[PDB]
Amino acid sequence: TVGAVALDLDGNLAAATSTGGMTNKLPGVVGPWPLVGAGCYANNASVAVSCTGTGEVFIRALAAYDIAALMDYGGLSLAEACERVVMEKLPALGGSGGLIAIDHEGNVALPFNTEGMYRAWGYAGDTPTTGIYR
Amino acid sequence: TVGAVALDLDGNLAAATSTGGMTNKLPGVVGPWPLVGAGCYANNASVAVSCTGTGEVFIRALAAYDIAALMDYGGLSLAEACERVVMEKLPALGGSGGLIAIDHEGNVALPFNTEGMYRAWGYAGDTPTTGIYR
Amino acid sequence: GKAVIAIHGGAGAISRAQMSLQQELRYIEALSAIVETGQKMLEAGESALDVVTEAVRLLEECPLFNAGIGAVFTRDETHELDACVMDGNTLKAGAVAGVSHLRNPVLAARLVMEQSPHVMMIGEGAENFAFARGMERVSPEIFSTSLRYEQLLAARKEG
Amino acid sequence: KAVIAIHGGAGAISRAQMSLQQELRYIEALSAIVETGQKMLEAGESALDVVTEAVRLLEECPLFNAGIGAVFTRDETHELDACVMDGNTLKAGAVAGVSHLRNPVLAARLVMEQSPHVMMIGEGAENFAFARGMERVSPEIFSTSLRYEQLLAARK
Ligand SMILES: [Cl-]
Ligand SMILES: [Cl-]
Ligand SMILES: [Cl-]
Ligand SMILES: [Cl-]
Ligand SMILES: [Cl-]
Ligand code: NA
Ligand code: NA
């Protein structure tokens, strides 16, 4: 799985995700990646999110939309909503993974509960940041 | 599309949805019905929901989970969450349809913004109620 | 606590002008029978998960409703069926989409839920998983009804 | 405050089993893609076009499990999925289970823009794309040695 989220100069959010699924997957399995609200979500009112990890858990937890709803309805910060979903709710269902998120104020979060997540980010006009490990 | 929601004597919620889609649909289209959080959702913490109507809008608005999140995070009653989603948010996106919902306290709601919705409900030990029109 | 069921058979443009009371009564009688089965199962201590599975299985079997037997026709005069089920206790779910050879999609969804580590399967992969777990293969012709074929015809031109 | 973030997957990445030069191939790929998105944002390109292009580049890069470099299924096939959502209009497009589309994210965007649907699957999704001039690719153009060896190891 791969993904991207962005906030543009006009204040618009967008998200995308693409994958091959899991090595040795049972043919016909659909994970959260092509599912709006599970693998991918964007709403200018709140956040743009793209997810990666244990597919069935991100569907059950509606992880991408849950970030949005925790912020919009719960009043959580982006960082608190990410901590809640990735470090608490996903492991409680037996899930491993992470996500990338940008809110409408341009806060960015790249939470993950795995050993690694290939990731990078950067503000327009600035040097990018990259990572693999924790 | 058809569906069912229930609350059992043990306090457990469940939801199910099944469909043939739309007459004359393009082969390969998936509407909101098989999709957790769009057409079907259940969580003992909140609500069980089964949806029917404009496929694309129920996905974009994650209607079934939105009921749950409005109740759990927003503190809305079942009736308030149902009005918000079915009578305000879905029409704002051009969506037509309805849903059935039971919350963890045993309240039942059968909102729809269409001319009709084939529907029925009943408490265990009570006489059932049926409807077609408004 | 107070157990309860609700069911639906679809939302859309129903008008009184279009309907006879006998037509309406077929729908009322079917809905009443299915909700009464659900109520009786709840009263007897059956799980919410088993009750919504059985109710939707009955709505599938009922030709009046667009699910299972009585499914609408696609542009290609095919049937493509989808279903989902979710357990609020465990937050497990199962779903199938784009299946044509499974009589009761909700039962296939329950099989994904209960007999796999997955939530959603599609198309031939979903069918093959179900068949490997002993679910019967049917012809998609079993879903066809004159009422839904006439609705396809009324929506198109012939050639 | 325009900004982009990308990812190339979360999971068990082991540093004992990695050289710095191996890691740097991933860092260099991520850095190049984020820089392309940053430059598009600075130029006034839309968030939707930026995430589409970033994901298209991650698909093209064989290092990442999307598009070229997709993992293998139990049957030594590829089954690809993608989604894209516009936070301004709340429109979305998605494809699942496609094997003959080079760039699933572009097919997802095609569903969003050229149909009233959000999600299409399998051969019906492919046929929708092909009927709109998207190219049919050989199903095997995604295959790489590294992902085939990981398949062999997953079985063992
Ligand atoms: Cl890990
Ligand atoms: Cl930066
Ligand atoms: Cl690192
Ligand atoms: Cl209507
Ligand atoms: Cl009525
Ligand atoms: Na039926
Ligand atoms: Na790739």
Residue numbers in the entry:
A (entry chain BBB), B (entry chain DDD): 179 to 312
C (entry chain CCC): 2 to 160
D (entry chain AAA): 3 to 158
The study reports:
l-Asparaginases hydrolyze l-asparagine to l-aspartic acid and ammonia. The prototypic class 2 enzyme is EcAIII from E. coli. EcAIII belongs to the Ntn-hydrolases, which are expressed as immature polypeptides that dimerize and then autocatalytically cleave themselves into α (∼20 kDa) and β (∼15 kDa) subunits to form the mature (αβ)2 heterotetramer (a dimer of two αβ heterodimers). The same Thr179 acts as the nucleophile in the autoproteolytic maturation and in l-asparagine hydrolysis.
As this is currently the highest resolution EcAIII structure deposited in the PDB, this variant will be discussed separately. High-quality electron-density maps allowed us to observed fine details, for example the environment of Thr179 and the octahedral coordination sphere of the Na+ ion in the stabilization loop. In mutant RDM1-18 the D211W substitution introduced a bulky Trp side chain into the immediate neighborhood of the Thr179 nucleophile. Nevertheless, this mutation did not affect autoprocessing. The side chain of Trp211 filled the available space between the threonine triad and the fragment built from residues 207–210 containing the S211P substitution. In chain B, disorder was detected in the active site, while in the corresponding region of subunit D two alternative conformations of Trp211 are visible. The double conformation of Trp211 is correlated with the behavior of the 230–236 fragment, for which two alternative conformations are also visible. Waters w3 and w4 are absent in variants with bulky side chains at position 211, such as Gln (RDM1-3) or Trp (RDM1-18). The observations collected in this list indicate that even small distortions of any element responsible for maintaining the fragile architecture of the autoproteolytic center can abolish or significantly impair the autocleavage process. As shown in Fig. 8(b), the mutations introduced in the autoprocessed RDM1 variants were not harmful to the sensitive apparatus, and even the large side chain of Trp211 in variant RDM1-18, located in the close proximity of the nucleophilic Thr179, did not perturb the autoprocessing.
